[PDB]
Amino acid sequence: MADVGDMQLYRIEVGRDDGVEVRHIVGAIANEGDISSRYIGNIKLFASHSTIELPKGMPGEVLQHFTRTRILNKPMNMQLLGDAQ
């Protein structure tokens, strides 16, 4: 029920072996904005990777400010594999 419906699956280069969990990337984005632990789509947590889908429908906010600054939570080294339905 976002403004547009931007829905995709982005995987980061961070996992349990790195220092991140399922409640880490979730509670981070869920606490930063209005997003909730349930609102989030599918979330993955590998050894050194993790996926997540945001129902948000108006990106470009974090990519602007956090364009050079990122972390386990922020898009440090992730890529777009999904696509907006």
Query: DSSP characters for 11-69?
Result: EES--TTTT--HHHHHHHHHHHSS--TTTS------SS-EEE----S---SHHHHTTS-
Cβ–Cβ < 8 Å for 57, 5 = yes
List of residues 6+ apart from 34 with CB closer than 8 A: none
Technique behind the model: NMR
**Residue environment code for 14-49, b if the CB has 16+ CB neighbours within 10 A, otherwise e:** bbeeeebeeebbbebbbeeeebeeebbeebebeeeb
List of residues 6+ apart from 65 with CB closer than 8 A: none
Q: How far apart are CA 67 and CA 63, in angstroms?
A: 5
User: Token pair for residue 73?
Assistant: 């939570």
